[PDB]
C-alpha cells in the first residue's frame, strides 16, 4: 500500500558506544547501506548520516542520527519534514529488550516500550507512532535496574553472532519491506530460527 521512503537505524555516536547493544538498528542500516553500495554522508542539516538509493521510481533514504539516542527525533523529524515523508513511509530499526538475540520481528505502531529513542521520535513527529519498526532482539538482563548498564555494554561473542544472524534474516526480506508489504514481510521473517 505505502512504499517505505525512510529507514532509520538508532544508536549512540562515538567510539565508546560503537558495537554496544543499543546500536543494533544503526548496525542494521550500516549493513544495509553496504549491501546496497550506498554511501552514508555526514550532513549537519539532518543531525546524522544520510544515504539515498532509488527503488521503483522513488528515492529511499537511510539515516543514522548522530545525536544522542534520547534526541533522535530531532534527526528524524528534520529529514522527514524536509522531504515531506509521512510517518507510515518510515521504518525504524532498533534494539529490542523483549526478544532474545537471534530474533527479529516487525511491528506497526504501538508504544515506545520504554525505549528513549523511540519515545523521542514519537514526540518529535507530533505524537505520531504510526511508523513501522524492525525490532532486533538483544535480550533482557533480568531486572529493570540493570537495563541501562546492559544496553551500553558490548555483548559476548555468542550473542553478537546471533544478532548478526537476525540482521541477515532481516535484509533477506528487504524487497517486501521496501514495497510496504508488511504482511508478507512478517510471514517470511517471523518463521526464521537462529
From Swiss-Prot:
Gene3D superfamilies: Peptidyl-tRNA hydrolase (3.40.50.1470). It catalyses: an N-acyl-L-alpha-aminoacyl-tRNA + H2O = an N-acyl-L-amino acid + a tRNA + H(+). GO terms for biological process: protein quality control for misfolded or incompletely synthesized proteins; rescue of stalled ribosome. InterPro entries: Pept_tRNA_hydro, Pept_tRNA_hydro_CS, Pept_tRNA_hydro_sf. Pfam families: Pept_tRNA_hydro (PF01195). The record marks 12 as: Discriminates between blocked and unblocked aminoacyl-tRNA. TRNA binds at residues 17, 68, 70, 116. The record marks 95 as: Stabilizes the basic form of H active site to accept a proton. Keywords: Cytoplasm, Hydrolase, RNA-binding, tRNA-binding. It is found in: Cytoplasm. Its EC number is 3.1.1.29. GO terms for cellular component: cytoplasm. The active site is at residue 22. It is an enzyme of class 3 (hydrolase). The keyword Hydrolase applies. One of its GO terms (molecular function) is tRNA binding. Monomer. Hydrolyzes ribosome-free peptidyl-tRNAs (with 1 or more amino acids incorporated), which drop off the ribosome during protein synthesis, or as a result of ribosome stalling. Belongs to the PTH family. This is Peptidyl-tRNA hydrolase. It comes from Pseudomonas aeruginosa (strain ATCC 15692 / DSM 22644 / CIP 104116 / JCM 14847 / LMG 12228 / 1C / PRS 101 / PAO1).
